[PDB]
């Protein structure tokens, strides 16, 4: 329940999940599977 | 694809063969390498349970910190709102490029003598936000504290501590905490370099309502940013800070302790 | 009104608190969320990605140098490349990484790491090495043949430039301690191995060639790592 | 694959020691939407004339190298119908794509980290010059690689968008970046959004008396651009 | 017909025609310009979603300011109950012809010694409303402070602020701040002109329970406004107040600051 | 009564503040709103002349 | 909920809208189209 | 199978029988006695009500008991988190090998003279926890107070006592009340014996956010456990504690107070 | 009804039972009843 | 607000006291629960050998 009118009152998120970080560790164009060598 | 828990461990066998390579590896694509554990040795089967929400930005900024610390001359003195003077806060926002948050301020006051020895005396304090543009008050008993249009909180240094939140209130869609410019067009001066004008949002004055005889207030401001949201994580800070509106440094050899050889742990 | 009873902590401000509170500007409406590149929500998601060690740390040795391991051709046999510690809180060459940075805000760290290795001499140059992963109990090992009894890799230089070794979460408990510091708490109980490099055969040139090549070390969390309890950064 | 073939307008660019290509964030280059707009004026997008690679004057690696960098969109704003449409309007929005070229014989070694930052400043020092801060096409020299120019560890600059061109490997590298800001368009001329740095972690060494004159060259594309508020030619 | 955010913008493509003129007007009919962007140049479509609440009534009006501030002279005071001796929220009011609201009172009250220095000294303090007709207390300790019948709050200086709400209480349909008109028939005096009497409900006086010893009350007083409605918007006041109850001014020959030519920015 | 714990921020005076309090005459019934010419809602509609 | 007997005791108002501004901008006998002449 | 009372007792006639014998026992194989009340001696029905709460994990170890008592020195004191100074709560937790709990910690503070004789004056307190790893504060106004990430609390003399929650907080999968064990591979030094660095979570610091005049803080601590889960019960002790980290002891003769004779009761 | 986030926040538990002491009392392999000899 | 009256009681610390609180650390996940022999749930259990 929120007593107040604005969401700046309100109290801290609960979703405190994690998500798969390909963005920012193999952000290539082109897959390069794990059994694979990786030029070719 | 979002978890709740870190990645579970499965059995493995002995592989001999020329058809799998996973050690192979090429660090020149910029990509991290993808060599799991079960694929590197013989492995066993390991339910893990461990959750990941230590580390989540709320679990990491929501807690409060120190941003201002000053004392009262002549019954009066203001602060230009900026997280720049305190460097423990200061070093954690800039893990960011660009963040969207609200902010729960927390004001704690108290009464000294002219030798800064603390005082027991109670006595009513008031906190006015003066944003661009407005005039702010001269002195103790200026017009400008009717307040009418500008907020205010009044309270007193034998209640518990003040605190207000604020919403996100900035021109832009986000904060920039690294800003790559000039603040107008035709000044390409040195000390226009770097400031985004957009992050100003004014001063805070403070007063005692009334004069206290010989003695002064002292006052600490916290902050604790809420409902975090970021982009572009950013290098750590590795050097000291100078300066309270700019990131320069001076340079030095080295960032970790020496040792006798390279050989020797 | 309602009868009630006030409990001890009233009045307290505690930092970690979590309450409700008024607003200073109750009507205020926010600019709108736009599309922009590259948001994250954890910062596990960024310890996951490889940085440089420091591994060159002694006295003579200054800035972009520090990041280099030499090889050379050898006139003996079994020689020994480079040794550490595995702690990633640890004081010494980790502490500068991204890894190192967000392992000293914590006080407890699990799981396996990532080490990768790149190779940066002529395309004619040849050569093998052994790297080795020894579990806590003693020293680190003194020569190749105790190196070889724990966990390891042989790497044989071509075409692909680079190679990882997966150093493994073996440990008696579900959480280790970040410091080793033993002035105080005793905390070097929780040491958690070395890793070492020795030549398999010998690095092999072509004549008037670069007697002397560099490697650079490369580290990174992997998929089962996690961290607890916020502490100040001592940096 | 090792071999490449980029075409953008009137320009094609090839290759055959690549090694894949980085698509910064896991983004391509895309249009400003109706929901995120500001600006109420018809944009300006000039297609072909602007989006085609232009390459800039090329950089020696000598014994005493230590590193260089170029600004964005500072480099090419005074190049072509990019330079003059980039005058001539308030506020610009676009994404690039960037190719390094370096090549040496198997009788060499060295390598050079390629790195694309975000909201790079230049801060070894109190007081910026608008030289260092704005070198144009040219580009200038790094003064303070380790520190990375901005006080941070060079080891760790792996977390921006980067590729290794490694002598023994390949001799090429390419990045492709989409439009990043806190703000839906931006002025050309006051504000840099992405820098590109050039370092050497291994310097160069090779076989007695082989090839000692080594360049480095740098071609660069606009791609996805709208400007909008057309006045005078306006320039700092 | 209502709304609650600004409006959206179309896609416009060029036009050359003698039928369609939106850019010619007429200003001597009395009617503000109808020209839209989307005709005068050609624009592209933007969904426009930012909201309206900042501008409301409640949302200009809806905050507390300061209407009076006293001290006791013989351990009493008294107050006319009027909003025109500090000028900021008097100038606010002023942009309505009739207006009705509630109002939200709030008291804040403390120790003085006789050269105007604060003490900390907590005192039992008295308010009273004496509505027109009723009479008023003479000193600290006459006998109208039985307050049977007129309301009173009662309050120490080391509680918080004291606070009371009161609902719209003219014998009008709304109050009035502008009144072209004289008090009573057959007095067409200059002192007369431009005062409703329907606006005057009374005074507060207020005393300190017991006789200090030297000291004296200060006491200040917060009006917030709640519920507004309004009707006809006036011009907005142009030059400084004079006097507490009229409306007097001294004229000058500008309003904005001077430049050097009418063709230089 | 019930258990309850009092947080900071308790007893201050803030004034864009926005709480339910005890009126000073509770059985006051207010006279009848008129037909007026002329109400308005919002500064908007003023700024737009 | 409403804790008090009387109206005045109340909260502030929560209906921040706006409305149509013609009774303000155009009050005139007679309709004149955008697109038109003004006078004719 | 569990109970929520003790057990009744039945009826019982006479036995004369060579075929059960229930009186005769064996001690030698580890078992204690199966005699009922009833087998031993002619019973009567009796229904017994008595309940088992007080004697529970939660009925046993659920309150409130002293762990630190000390005064600032130049206006700061540090503790070590350990509960061996005040041997009451020492001797019950030692009566189980391995715990799992959760703690609420209170503490209560007040100003002293320099005679140790107690003060009537309200002053603002600070403590921070300090994990191991983290730098300490060295004095009163060190830079470390800052408390950016560090957990804090920080209250007055004259409110109530300060109070918080904690979890389990050990990398174990429970605390150890014993340790057959040493330290740290490769030293054996009789220092280093019976110590388990894992119990170790850290220091509490102390300041007064201002400097007092000539008085001193004095603070206690007092620990309460919550949510109990216990294994393996021991022998309880049964000679004095002699050191805070260790179970050091000395030999004495007897446990119980002596008599003349065994034949005299 | 939990009014906090994490459950060290919460009271006392009030599940105050005993159960069957067998597991301290008669750890032995082969059973022995009351009624019969120990040793046989 | 809602109107209170305060009892007496209020502000004092006893012992076996039991109310809710806040949490210094709000996000710790504690360690998992290992079988282990031995467990123990009432003192009644021990006093019986
Ligand atoms: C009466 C209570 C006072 C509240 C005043 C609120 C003013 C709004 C403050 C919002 C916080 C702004 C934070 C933005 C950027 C940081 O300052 C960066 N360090 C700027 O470089
Ligand atoms: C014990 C608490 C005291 C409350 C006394 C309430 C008296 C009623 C006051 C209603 C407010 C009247 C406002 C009306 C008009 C303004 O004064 C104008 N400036 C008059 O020119
Ligand atoms: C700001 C409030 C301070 C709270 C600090 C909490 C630190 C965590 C303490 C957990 C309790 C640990 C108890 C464990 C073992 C005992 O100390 C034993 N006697 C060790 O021999
Ligand atoms: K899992
Ligand atoms: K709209
Ligand atoms: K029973």
């Given at each position: 329940i929120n007593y107040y009118e604005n969401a700046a009152s309100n109290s801290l998120n609960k979703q405190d999940f994690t998500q798969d970080p390909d963005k920012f560790t193999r952000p290539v164009a082109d897959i390069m599977k794990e059994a694979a060598v990786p030029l070719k | 694809t979002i978890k709740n828990t870190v990645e579970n461990t499965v059995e493995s066998t002995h592989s001999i063969s020329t058809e799998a390579t996973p050690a192979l590896q090429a660090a020149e694509t910029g990509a991290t390498s993808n060599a799991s554990d079960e694929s590197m040795i013989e492995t066993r089967n390991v339910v893990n349970t461990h959750?990941?929400?230590?580390?989540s930005l709320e679990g990491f900024y929501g807690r409060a910190g120190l941003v201002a610390m000053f004392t009262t001359e002549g019954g009066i003195r203001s602060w230009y709102i900026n997280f720049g003077k305190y460097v423990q806060l200061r070093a954690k926002l800039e893990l960011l490029t660009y963040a969207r948050f609200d902010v729960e301020f927390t004001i704690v006051a108290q009464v000294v003598d002219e030798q800064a020895k603390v005082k027991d005396f109670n006595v009513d304090y008031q906190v006015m936000y003066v944003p661009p543009g407005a005039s702010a008050p001269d002195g103790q008993d200026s017009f400008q504290w009717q307040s009418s249009c500008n907020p205010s909180v009044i309270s007193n240094t034998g209640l518990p501590p003040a605190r207000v939140s604020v919403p996100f209130?900035?021109?832009?869609n986000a904060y920039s905490f690294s800003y790559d410019g000039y603040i107008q067009f035709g000044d390409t001066s040195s000390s226009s370099y770097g400031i985004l004008p957009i992050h100003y949002l004014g001063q805070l004055v403070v007063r005692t309502c009334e004069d206290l005889d010989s003695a002064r207030l002292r006052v600490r401001i916290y902050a604790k940013p809420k409902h975090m949201r970021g982009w572009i994580p950013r290098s750590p800070r590795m050097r000291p800070y100078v300066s309270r509106f700019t990131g320069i440094y001076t340079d030095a050899p080295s960032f970790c302790v020496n040792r006798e050889s390279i050989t020797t742990a | 009104g309602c009868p009630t009873l006030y409990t001890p902590g009233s009045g307290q401000f505690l930092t970690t608190d979590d309450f409700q509170t008024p607003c200073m500007l109750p009507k205020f409406q926010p600019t709108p969320v736009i599309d922009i590149p590259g948001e994250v929500k954890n910062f596990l998601e960024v310890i996951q990605v490889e940085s440089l060690v420091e591994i060159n740390n002694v006295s003579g040795v200054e800035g972009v140098a520090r990041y280099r391991i030499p090889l050379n051709v050898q006139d003996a046999m079994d020689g020994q490349i480079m040794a550490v510690r595995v702690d990633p809180g640890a004081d010494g060459p980790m502490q500068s990484t991204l890894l190192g940075v967000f392992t000293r805000y914590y006080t407890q760290w699990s799981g396996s790491l990532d080490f990768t290795f790149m190779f940066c001499g002529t395309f004619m140059t040849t050569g093998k090495v052994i790297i080795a992963y020894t579990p806590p109990g003693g020293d680190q090992p003194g020569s190749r043949q105790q190196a070889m009894l724990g966990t390891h890799v042989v790497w044989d230089f071509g075409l692909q430039s680079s190679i990882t070794l997966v150093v493994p979460w073996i440990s008696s408990g579900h959480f280790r301690g970040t410091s080793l510091d033993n002035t105080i708490y005793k905390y070097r109980y929780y040491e958690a191995g070395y890793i070492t490099m020795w030549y398999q055969t010998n690095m092999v040139v072509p004549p008037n060639f670069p007697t002397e090549a560099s490697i650079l070390m490369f580290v990174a969390a992997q998929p089962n790592f996690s961290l607890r309890i916020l502490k100040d950064r001592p940096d | 694959d090792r071999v490449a073939q980029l075409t953008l307008g009137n320009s094609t660019i090839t290759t055959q020691e690549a090694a894949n290509i980085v698509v910064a964030y896991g983004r391509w280059p895309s249009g400003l939407r109706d929901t995120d707009a500001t600006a109420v004026d018809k944009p300006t997008q000039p297609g072909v004339s602007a989006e085609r690679f232009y390459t800039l004057p090329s950089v020696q690696w000598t014994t005493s190298f230590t590193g260089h960098y170029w600004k964005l969109p500072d480099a090419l704003s005074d190049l072509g119908l990019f330079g003059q449409n980039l005058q001539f309007h308030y506020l610009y929005r676009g994404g690039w794509a960037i190719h390094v070229q370096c090549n040496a014989t198997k009788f060499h070694q060295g390598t050079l980290l390629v790195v694309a930052v975000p909201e790079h400043k230049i801060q070894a020092q109190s007081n910026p010059s608008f030289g260092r801060t704005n070198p144009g096409e040219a580009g200038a020299a790094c003064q303070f690689p380790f520190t990375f120019e901005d006080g941070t560890a060079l080891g760790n600059a792996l977390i921006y968008p980067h590729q290794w061109i490694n002598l023994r490997t390949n001799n090429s590298a390419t990045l492709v970046l989409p439009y990043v800001n806190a703000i839906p368009m931006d002025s050309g001329i006051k504000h840099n959004n992405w820098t590109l740095l050039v370092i050497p972690i291994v310097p160069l060494e090779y076989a007695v008396g082989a090839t000692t004159f080594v360049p480095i060259t740098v071609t660069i594309a606009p791609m996805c651009t709208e400007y909008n508020g057309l006045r005078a030619a306006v320039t700092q």
């Open positions: - | 959750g990941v929400a230590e580390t209130m900035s021109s832009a | - | -």
